[PDB]
Amino acid sequence: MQFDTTGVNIPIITELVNDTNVQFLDQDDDDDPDTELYLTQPFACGTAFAVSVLDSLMSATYFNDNILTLIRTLVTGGATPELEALIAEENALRGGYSTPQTLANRDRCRVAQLALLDGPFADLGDGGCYGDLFCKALKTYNMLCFGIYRLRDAHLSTPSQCTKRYVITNPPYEFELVPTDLIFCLMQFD
Amino acid sequence: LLSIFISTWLTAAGFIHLVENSGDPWENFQNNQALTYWECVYLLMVTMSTVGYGDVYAKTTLGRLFMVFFILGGLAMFASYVPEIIELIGNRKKYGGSYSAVSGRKHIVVCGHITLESVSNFLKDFLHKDRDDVNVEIVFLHNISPNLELEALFKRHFTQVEFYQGSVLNPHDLARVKIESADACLILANKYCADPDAEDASNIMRVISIKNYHPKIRIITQMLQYHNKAHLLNIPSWNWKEGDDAICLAELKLGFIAQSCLAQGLSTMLANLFSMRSFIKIEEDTWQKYYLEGVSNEMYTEYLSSAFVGLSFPTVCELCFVKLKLLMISRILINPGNG
Amino acid sequence: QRMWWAFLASSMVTFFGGLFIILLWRTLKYLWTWMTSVKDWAGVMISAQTLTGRVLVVLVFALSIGALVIYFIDSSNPIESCQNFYKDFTLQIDMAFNVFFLLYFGLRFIAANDKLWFWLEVNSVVDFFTVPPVFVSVYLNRSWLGLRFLRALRLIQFSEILQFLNILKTSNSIKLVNLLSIFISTWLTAAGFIHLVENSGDPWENFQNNQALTYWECVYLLMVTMSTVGYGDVYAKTTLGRLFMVFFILGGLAMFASYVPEIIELIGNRKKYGGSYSAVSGRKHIVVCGHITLESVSNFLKDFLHKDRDDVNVEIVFLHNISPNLELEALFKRHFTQVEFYQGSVLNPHDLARVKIESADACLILANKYCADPDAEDASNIMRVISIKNYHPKIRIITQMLQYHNKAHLLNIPS
Ligand SMILES: CC(C)CCC[C@@H](C)[C@H]1CC[C@H]2[C@@H]3CC=C4C[C@@H](O)CC[C@]4(C)[C@H]3CC[C@]12C
Ligand SMILES: CC(C)CCC[C@@H](C)[C@H]1CC[C@H]2[C@@H]3CC=C4C[C@@H](O)CC[C@]4(C)[C@H]3CC[C@]12C
Ligand SMILES: CC(C)CCC[C@@H](C)[C@H]1CC[C@H]2[C@@H]3CC=C4C[C@@H](O)CC[C@]4(C)[C@H]3CC[C@]12C
Ligand SMILES: CC(C)CCC[C@@H](C)[C@H]1CC[C@H]2[C@@H]3CC=C4C[C@@H](O)CC[C@]4(C)[C@H]3CC[C@]12C
Ligand SMILES: [Ca+2]
Ligand SMILES: [Mg+2]
Ligand SMILES: [Mg+2]
């Protein structure tokens, strides 16, 4: 689709049931049936996600009991066991009159995706001290960084027009930094 | 089949012994070929097996006539009986028998949808080098006998995995695999099924049977919807407070999508954190190199040091990552601010 | 004297004494009348998980082969013999091989769980019958060709050890190697049995039944017997040989007639229409996929190769996952120089690079008109144009749809 821009830059996410169908989503990639789903491009971009990557959750939840609890409370919105009991008894979430203890249930440290080119943290955007970057994030707002959502050709010198960004989990201290960057960060709960 | 075959073999051999040993009246009993009964037995087994050595045969014409009228029945009888007897003997249960509980070592039990690719994808994540060394053994339980490729996978991870054929709906099978002495039971659900309620129902019945045998065990299972979680909660010994796992693949996928729906990339950011991925390295600097640098990270739980637990957890946030070169994240607590 | 009995006696007393000794141990355990670490070390040595275990199991392979060739050498010797291991090369290697086999059996017995079922295992029974008598022979400085023919049963474990060493992974090759190993092992083993029994005379006949046969003569005899030919040029004349033949052929014929067709099937049923398409220089070529049957190909080829059309140097490269029948192959043999076939789906970029679709002039897709679901056939054509544009978007696709709204779906593709 096109508009008075094109629709290639539009961020979509599609579920899949076949891992071997993931090559049809993009065009600018060396497609390969031997390349696994974690290694192929559009899953790394995040625009594709199949259910079959959750097979490792069995081993994870065996080896630590707290993993499923952490993933549920990070992902579905903090399913407390009281909420699960109310679900099992009602099968419909209801509304109640708030109290100060009810208003204390705004204290989930929220997920967010902020830009590195503009903002109060944009004062460095061309460093390499990623460690100093997240320590500045700490000493500013206790903003826990996760990892750099950098563009694919942002590590290149030949300027392309590819706005497909790919995630990088846990960047080290001496990891570089382009200003055209989105960051996976968690600020404190509202 | 054995009685009929042995009876007609010995009976026709005795017939040939009598007729062959006795001479022929037309020949004035000059056809009396000197044969023993066991020689006639060997002759008839050669004949029914259609070998036909011709070292010893019938020379009397009555013996030859009996042989001609015999082989019509005998060959069809042999070729239809001996394959059947060879089938009925030996087609047995090769993967029966009990699992020896190794002392000083826990073991898990895995049942559910068990196929080659599912077992392989489970075993790499369970036996990966990145995970801490595991002395726990893996005891499978599945009513279908495995194929040769699954047997080859078992022969690969021989010392760590064992297989035992049987359904999970038999308490004799459960005592056979020693599920009471097992550390934790696991259930792998078939994702790609034609009926997401019928596969759900089979997993329901499996968790029901395991909790019916031994309710004091930890079941880590996977469902397909969210309402089925309530059905799991219906079981009395299915208690969230006690250690248990009820993964809901559809619910988890929807949650990951709804989290990346506000922070694009977070779904695969989380999904890479659980496949145990060793640090692979490629030569050239593509995006894949800097991304495999990402996917080499996983999620682990480490008890804090007396310094770390001491003073303020919010204070011990800052500079925690640099000191141990690790990423740090009495209940569910992420971003500790404000043992 | 003629000390033949000592070897069989030694093997039998080791086997049955271990069997009886195991039973005695169980009684002691009843009524109260680090082992795991040495056991699973033996287990990871038996499996090929370590480099030590890998070189151990390849040595088991190689020395089982070597002991078999040593038996084939000593089969030409007389039955009873008197030989010094230091004095002659004979038994110099076999001794070392059986020392290694004794070590390997010790490792396997340590690694095994159930002692009685390990003792009642054929790979242990062959050890019990082969490693004692060579030591008995090298102590007594004599030689008997006893049950040295049983060493061919060490071929029974080749599929297991290749499964350990990851050479055998796929089910066809696993079943093939299983069948080949079992067939060759039982053929050579029963031939060695007949060689020993036939060569040795009969005690009732005072050893006057000692028919002079070679091992390869017995091998030929048994292949004639299992193939049910029955020449009768050479047969068993000893009554023990005849009894073994009678009890053999019941298993052997069923084994032959169920194995040899299966091995003949598993060998040679291969991909005849694989391989790459050579891009002829100075000549364009097209690629045709989609619903490909005999009448559709014929109706396409007459219109494409017709005299009225201008002479075409362009070749036609088909691509279809179903292997063609004999009539479609005859059509290809008719238009041999102009058309080629290559088996494969269009949804594989390896197949597309194999048929050289990037170097191809134009891709064509023939849709199945007469289908039970005009949306499902439409959907298959959709996925085919998707895969071709996913591999190479710079190509011209000439396709055929079944409705008009599907034209918009084709337009959805960027290229
Ligand atoms: C038993 C049935 C089913 C088969 C038929 C066999 C009988 C009826 C026939 C076939 C061959 C015949 C033999 C032919 C040659 C001589 C002729 C004369 O000297 C009488 C006896 C004798 C020896 C005959 C006896 C009867 C006979 C044995
Ligand atoms: C399980 C084992 C012990 C059973 C095997 C039976 C063996 C050991 C027995 C049964 C009959 C025995 C033979 C009978 C007579 C001969 C001739 C004599 O001059 C010396 C002993 C000798 C050679 C005997 C020793 C070996 C022998 C063959
Ligand atoms: C006949 C039987 C008793 C032979 C057994 C030989 C024993 C005493 C010797 C031979 C080689 C040894 C092994 C060599 C090294 C391994 C790994 C090491 O990290 C701990 C000890 C362990 C596991 C040893 C256990 C005992 C051992 C198996
Ligand atoms: C091995 C089993 C399964 C088959 C049965 C064979 C044995 C038990 C039997 C069948 C034929 C028998 C033979 C019959 C004739 C003579 C009788 C006497 O002089 C003793 C030895 C001898 C030579 C016998 C030895 C024992 C014997 C060999
Ligand atoms: Ca693509
Ligand atoms: Mg074990
Ligand atoms: Mg050509």
Author numbering:
A (entry chain A): 830 to 833, 871 to 1056
B (entry chain A): 238 to 566, 577 to 585, 592
C (entry chain D): 19 to 51, 93 to 474
Reproduce the article's own wording on this structure.
The Slo1 channel, also known as BK or MaxiK, distinguishes itself from other K+ channels by its unusually large single-channel conductance (~10–20 times greater than most other K+ channels) and dual regulation by intracellular Ca2+ and membrane voltage. Because both Ca2+ and membrane voltage gate Slo1, it serves as a hub in numerous physiological processes that couple membrane excitability to Ca2+ signaling events such as muscle contraction, audition, hormone secretion, and neurotransmitter release. Slo1 functions as a tetramer of the pore-forming α subunit, which is encoded by a single gene, Slowpoke (KCNMA1). In this study we present the structures of a mammalian (human) Slo1 channel consisting of the α subunit alone and in complex with the brain-enriched β4 subunit.
The final protein sample of Slo1 co-expressed with the β4 subunit contained both the α subunit and the β4 subunit confirmed by SDS-PAGE and mass spectrometry. Structures of human Slo1 in four distinct states were determined: Ca2+-free and Ca2+-bound α subunit alone as well as Ca2+-free and Ca2+-bound α-β4 complex at resolutions of 4.0 Å, 3.8 Å, 3.5 Å and 3.2 Å, respectively. In each case (presence and absence of β4 subunit) we have determined the structures of Ca2+-activated (open) and Ca2+-depleted (closed) conformations. The Ca2+-bound structures of the human Slo1 α subunit determined in the absence and presence of the β4 subunit are essentially identical to each other (RMSD 2.0 Å). Ca2+ binding to two unique Ca2+ binding sites per α subunit produces protein conformational changes that splay the S6 (inner) helices, causing a wide pathway for ion diffusion to open between the cytoplasm and the transmembrane pore. The Ca2+ binding sites are located within the cytoplasmic ‘gating ring’, which is centered on the four-fold channel axis just beneath the transmembrane pore. When Ca2+ binds, a domain of the gating ring closest to the membrane, called the RCK1 N-lobe, expands away from the channel’s central axis; expansion of all four RCK1 N-lobes, one from each subunit, produces a radial expansion, as shown. Since the RCK1 N-lobes are connected directly to the S6 helices via the S6-RCK1 linkers, their expansion produces pore opening. Structural details of the Ca2+ binding site reorganization upon Ca2+ binding, RCK1 N-lobe expansion and pore opening observed in human Slo1 are essentially the same as those observed previously in acSlo1. The structures support this proposal because the Ca2+ binding sites are unaltered by the presence of β subunits.
